[PDB]
Design a protein around this ligand. Structure first.
Ligand code: CA
Ligand code: CA
Length: 269
């Protein structure tokens, strides 16, 4: 039997799938700990930039769970992602320990732009800026990639990098009451928010697990971006980003929430 996680229903992704918008023909790169083979996922390819781990398989769990919020398959098992027909690419930039070097994330972003990805999901972040990282964000953006990044989980009133950079779309986390989750970083540069508490998705060992974090909010927006691109295939990364903000539901403070809650129904109208 298949279960629809509350967050998927909260961003109104079934209303888009009822219009025939599933993410088909949109390439989405998940720059994370890898993606493990799973019955409710279809991985099309990828690359690893982690020296001790030449495989794209996930030794952690985090990248698999991210991948499932974006694109868990629409069938009779497991769960359902926002864009269940997106072409999923596993770009391992972080190791089995969740740790990763900035050089690894920056070549992940160069691979994305070199391989014609439409959206790159970075559910990772640092409180410090990096020249290397910002240059990689900018080069993937000028190669048409929409870079979507987590605001961070420290609860502080300023957001992490790369989300703070102008060319990355910054995503915060909400709870089931549409309040800011207490860990969700906010402040200048935050663009939008999405569900990030008690998020059920695909996990290694052909199972399902619940996690909390702005890392779980980010894939809801990466997926909504794939829905808008299949609907509007000529739109650029900036057009898609502004539309998602223009159609988001206001939740209060632009300081806390940016444009508000992503809404895949209103975005594919
Ligand atoms: Ca499924
Ligand atoms: Ca930004």
């Amino acid at each position: 039997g298949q279960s629809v996680p509350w967050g998927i229903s909260r961003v109104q992704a079934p209303a888009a799938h009822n219009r025939g918008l599933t993410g088909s023909g949109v390439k989405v790169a998940v720059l994370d700990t890898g993606i493990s083979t799973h019955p409710d996922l279809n991985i099309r390819g990828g690359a690893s930039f982690v020296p001790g781990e030449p495989s794209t398989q996930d030794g952690n769990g985090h990248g698999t769970h991210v991948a499932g919020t974006i694109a868990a398959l629409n069938n009779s098992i497991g769960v359902l992602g926002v864009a269940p027909s997106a072409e999923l690419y596993a770009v391992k930039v972080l190791g089995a320990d969740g740790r990763g070097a900035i050089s690894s994330i920056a070549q992940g972003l160069e691979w994305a732009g070199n391989n014609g990805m439409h959206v790159a999901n970075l559910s990772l972040g640092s409180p410090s800026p990096s020249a290397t990282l910002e240059q990689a964000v900018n080069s993937a953006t000028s190669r048409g990639v929409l870079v979507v990044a987590a605001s961070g989980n420290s609860g502080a009133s300023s957001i992490s990098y790369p989300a703070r950079y102008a060319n990355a779309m910054a995503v915060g986390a909400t709870d089931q009451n549409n309040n800011r989750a207490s860990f969700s970083q906010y402040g200048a540069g935050l663009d939008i928010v999405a569900p990030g508490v008690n998020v059920q998705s695909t996990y290694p060992g052909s199972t399902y697990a619940s996690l909390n974090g702005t890392s779980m909010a980010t894939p809801h927006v990466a997926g909504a971006a794939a829905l808008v691109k299949q609907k509007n295939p000529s739109w650029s990364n900036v057009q898609i980003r502004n539309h998602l903000k223009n159609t988001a539901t206001s939740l209060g403070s632009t300081n806390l929430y940016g444009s508000g809650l992503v809404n895949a129904e209103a975005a594919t109208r």
